[PDB]
Amino acid sequence: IVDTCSLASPASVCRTKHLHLRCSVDFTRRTLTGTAALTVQSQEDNLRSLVLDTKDLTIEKVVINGQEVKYALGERQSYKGSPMEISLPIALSKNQEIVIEISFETSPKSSALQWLTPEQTSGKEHPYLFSQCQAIHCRAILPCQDTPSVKLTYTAEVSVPKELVALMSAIRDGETPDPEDPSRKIYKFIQKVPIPCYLIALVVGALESRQIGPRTLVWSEKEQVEKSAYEFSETESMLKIAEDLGGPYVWGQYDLLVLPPSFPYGGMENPCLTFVTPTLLAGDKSLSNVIAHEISHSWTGNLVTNKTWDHFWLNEGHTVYLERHICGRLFGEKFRHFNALGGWGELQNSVKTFGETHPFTKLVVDLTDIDPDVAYSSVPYEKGFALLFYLEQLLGGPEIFLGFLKAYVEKFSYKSITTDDWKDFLYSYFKDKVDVLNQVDWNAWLYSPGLPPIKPNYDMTLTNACIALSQRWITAKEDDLNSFNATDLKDLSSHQLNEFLAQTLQRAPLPLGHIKRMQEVYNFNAINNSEIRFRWLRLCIQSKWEDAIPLALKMATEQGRMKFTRPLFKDLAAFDKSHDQAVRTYQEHKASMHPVTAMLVGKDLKV
Ligand SMILES: N[C@@H](CCC(=O)Nc1ccc(OCc2ccccc2)cc1)C(=O)O
Ligand SMILES: [Yb+3]
Ligand SMILES: [Yb+3]
Ligand SMILES: [Yb+3]
Ligand SMILES: [Zn+2]
């Protein structure tokens, strides 16, 4: 299969084996400037020119073997960017490799980067920069074959103001004063494991660290360090469980970076340095499943990688599966089943939101002429997980299926694969059960829109009390309201509180008086746990409670995790009382927002 999201030469023509990156970070001008030395290997005889991906890059020169060579930038093709064709001085034959060094400058409007002014940080004294390349934004930092079908090693030296710290998705390789003059410091990095280019990450800011494990430091601004070190304490014990499930952890260090509130996702599995949203800082470790998730990518995703974005579910379905086994080992099989069932509920929501015949509710998708950031949703996570959970139960239980998963990881490590590679390895591993495998509706699961053709079995132990309470609220009449009491919540974990709200939200609106009484007896306004507050405020807004309007606007703008921010703005726009303020608030904020988030909310709000 070809990668329809890249304009570069396909891996069937040439392959980038290594990147050498030397660049400087300029906050005054909001540019990354430097050279990108690509070691490229030909896959055919008589290769004379190749094409790379770029987006809003300024190219100063292309050097090969000490000399400057010819290159042409084609017309930009919307979200894909502009193809950069490079002429080779000598015609390459199979397995022969050249090193092409490209002098480049990034635009301040790079979709891969957010540049924060000092007022936008916790410290107020220093600026901050962070990248987010997945799915196809690496090209907006430097020219490359921007496709997961290619894996390269890389080494980096980056020059930053000496008061600031730089970190990458690599092993830290020391720091020295920048010899070439300024009171700038230069930081070195090495990534010895080949990775898809979407896993290249950079952060520069006033960073402090704290060690919480033998191979884990936590990084953030000073004011979040102590809280982060506490929140993510369990990290090493999750890594050990993950190593037991997936095989050896090959990356060396597992550091964590806690970004500014505008970081668009819950986390990003950048090798050697996972990124996480500060919205995880609940103060009780209750949102640590996100860490377990990013840890599991150290095998499914980063070692075995989707060959194109059409097969994204391979990355996410398997990682959610491992994530939930980690948490199940830590807190019990009953908790694993509770999280599993909650995930099915999230799938129901996604399918209803898109519509059951919508192409984005298929497991394997076709992103031809679709911006990946627009297609993104929980469908590949939860439909992918549901398929693996169904197969787990079909093939004889978690022990058996986990054996498959480890052999799967071993088999395809360091490779990029398609859904078909996965499936006929499944059939090969389970040759003794092919008759069982032939029972599953593969066409429906892989290719049909909507909910899966069959629902797995879920233990109900921890879910039952959530169902009882949500139903009482959903069906309550006037004479029931006075019976509700804070004692209803007595034996419910925060996880169950969240699930209670999720179930209730599925049936919103509730009558306004009900939602008022709910705050009266449960005081959800006071809970800072982001998942819970998110769903509570959605329920308040969809139920037409005007008092919740400032609370919702505040959460939507004070952080920028798209999971929270997009639906809050969307609920507020749909509420006639808050619509105008919602649009005005977005217009006033969008200049200071992450570029992808700004774009998506603007589409959402239709402005
Ligand atoms: N990878 C991170 C979250 C960030 C992430 O996955 N972003 C991302 C962004 C755009 C993407 O586009 C590809 C795609 C492929 C299939 C369906 C929908 C979207 C895919 C992934 C995590 O799972 O913790
Ligand atoms: Yb210039
Ligand atoms: Yb310049
Ligand atoms: Yb009644
Ligand atoms: Zn993931």
The Cβ of residue 492 has, within 10 Å, a number of other Cβ atoms equal to 16
- Asked if the peptide bond before residue 135 counts as cis, ω within 30 degrees of 0, the response is yes
Distance 467 CA to ligand 5 centre (A): 28
| Rounded-to-integer distance, Cα 10 and Cα 153, Å | 18
Residue 293's nearest CA partner among 362, 341, 339, 334 is: 339
Query: According to the annotation, is 594 in a ligand binding site?
Result: no
**Cα 256 to Cα 550: distance, rounded to the nearest angstrom:** 33
Please report the DSSP string for 377-402 in residue order: SSHHHHHHHHHHHHHHHHTT-HHHHH
Order the strands of the 255-258 sheet from edge to edge.
Answer: 208-213, 216-220, 255-258, 273-276, 267-268
- Strand pairing category for 208-213 and 31-42: unpaired
The pairing of strands 267-268 and 273-276 is antiparallel
- For residues 187 and 175, the answer to whether their CB atoms sit within 8 Å is yes
* Method used to solve the structure: X-ray
Cβ atoms of 553 and 516 within 8 Å: the answer is: no
380 lines ligand 1 (CB under 6 A): yes
What would the two tokens of residue 143 be? 């020219």
The residue whose C-alpha atom lies closest to atom 13 belonging to ligand 1 is 372
Cα 107 from chain centroid (whole Å): 23
> Is the Cβ–Cβ distance between 282 and 530 less than 8 Å?
yes
Correct CATH for 460-607 of 1.10.600.10, 1.25.40.320, 1.25.10.10, 3.20.10.10: 1.25.40.320
Burial class (CB in 10 A: 0-12, 13-18, 19+), 350: buried
The catalytic position among 157, 221, 294, 531 is: 294
Ligand 5: centre distance to CA 294 (Å): 6
Q: Which atom of ligand 1 is nearest to the CA of 267?
A: 24
The protein residue whose alpha carbon is closest to atom 19 in ligand 1 is 376
Domain assignments of the chain as residue spans, ordered by start: 13-205, 206-302, 303-459, 460-607
Question: Token digits for 126?
Answer: 């220093």
The minimum-distance atom of ligand 1 relative to the CA of 264 is: 4
315/419 Cα distance (integer angstroms): 10
Q: Please tell me the distance from the alpha carbon of residue 219 to that of residue 464, in angstroms, as a whole number.
A: 39
Q: Known binder of ligand: residue 587?
A: no
CB 156 less than 6 A from any atom of ligand 1: no
Rounded to whole angstroms, how far apart are CA atoms 239 and 245?
Answer: 10
Say which ligand is closest to the CA of 201: 1
Q: What is the 3-state secondary structure (H, E, C) of 302-337?
A: CCEEECCHHHHHHHHHHHHHHHHHHHHHHHCHHHHH
Binding site annotation covers 272? Answer: no
How far is the C-alpha of 600 from the C-alpha of 160, rounded, in Å?
31
Residue given tokens 């060959």 in the structure block: 307
Nearest protein Cα to ligand 1, atom 2: 268
Ligand with the closest atom to the CA of 32: 3
The residues facing 85 across adjacent strands are 51, 72
Distance of CA 7 to the CA centre of its chain: 23
3 state DSSP class of 441: coil
Distance CA 243, CA 228 (A): 23
Residue 283 DSSP SS3: coil
DSSP bridge pairs for 308? none
> How far apart are the CA of 58 and the centre of ligand 3, in A?
8
Per-residue b or e along 44-73, where b marks 16 or more CB atoms closer than 10 Å to that residue's CB: eeebeebbbbbbbbeeeebbbeeeebebeb
Residue 359: closest CA among 448, 293, 232, 234? 448
Contact 497, 534 (CB under 8 A): no
491 alpha carbon to ligand 1 midpoint, in Å? 36
Of the CA atoms within 13 Å of residue 489, those in its CB half-sphere come to 16
> What SS3 string covers 533-600?
HHHHHHHHHHCCCHHHHHHHHHHHHHCCCHHHHHHHHHHHHHCCCCHHHHHHHHHHHHHHCCHHHHHH
User: For this experimental structure, what is the resolution in angstroms?
Assistant: 2.1
Q: Is 264 annotated as a binding residue?
A: yes
Beta partners for 184?
161
**Residue of 131, 134, 298 best suited for mutating to test ligand 1, as the one with most atoms within 8 Å of CB:** 134
User: Is the C-beta atom of 157 inside 6 A of ligand 1?
Assistant: no
Residue nearest to atom 20 of ligand 1 (CA): 135
> Which regions of 319-472 does DSSP assign to beta strands (E)?
415-417
**Ligand 2 mean position, distance from CA 35 (Å):** 14
For residue 376 and ligand 1, the question of a CB distance below 6 A is answered with yes
Q: At what angle are helices 579-589 and 595-605 packed, to 10 degrees?
A: 150
Ligand nearest to the CA of 4: 1
* Ligand 1 pocket test target in 133, 309, 321 with most atoms within 8 Å of CB: 309
* Whether the CB of 381 sits within 6 Å of ligand 1: no
Cα–Cα distance for residue pair 36/59, rounded to 1 Å: 11
Q: Cα 271–274–276 angle (5° rounding)?
A: 155
Would the CB of 500 count as within 6 Å of ligand 1? no
Residues 257, 218: Cα–Cα separation, whole Å: 6
Tokens representing 355 are: 């519509």
Which backbone phi and psi does 415 adopt, to 5 degrees? -115, 160
Nearest CA to ligand 1 atom 7: 134
Contacts for 227-230 with beta carbons within 8 Å, 24 or more apart?
227/281, 227/283, 228/256, 228/258, 228/281, 230/283, 230/285
Helix (H) or strand (E) holding 285: none
Of the options 2.60.40.1730, 3.60.10.10, 3.30.420.130, 3.40.50.2000, the CATH number for the domain spanning 13-205: 2.60.40.1730
Task: Point out the ligand nearest to the CA of residue 112.
Answer: 1
Catalytic member of 154, 198, 321, 381: 381
Tell me whether strands 14-26 and 151-161 are parallel, antiparallel or unpaired: parallel
- Dmax of the chain from CA atoms? 85
Calculate how far, in angstroms, residue 462's C-alpha sits from the geometric centre of ligand 4.
Answer: 27
Q: What's the gap in Å between 77 CA and the centre of ligand 3?
A: 24
Q: Can 381 be counted among the known catalytic residues?
A: yes
- Can you spell out the DSSP letters for 188-210? EEEEEEEEEGGG--EEEES-EEE
Q: What is the C-alpha end-to-end distance of the chain, expressed in Å? A: 37
Enumerate long-range contacts of 126-129, CB under 8 Å, 24 or more apart.
126/163, 126/164, 126/205, 126/206, 127/27, 127/205, 128/204, 128/205, 128/206, 128/260, 129/25, 129/27, 129/202, 129/203, 129/204, 129/205
Between CA 178 and CA 166 the distance in angstroms is 13
Distances (CA, A) of 130 to 84, 259, 282, 286: 25, 8, 23, 26
Burial of 505: CB neighbours in 10 Å, binned 0-12, 13-18, 19+ = buried
CATH code matching the domain that covers 206-302, chosen among 3.30.2010.30, 3.60.15.10, 3.40.630.30, 3.90.1150.10: 3.30.2010.30
**79 assigned to active site:** no
CATH architecture, domain defined by 303-459: Orthogonal Bundle (1.10)
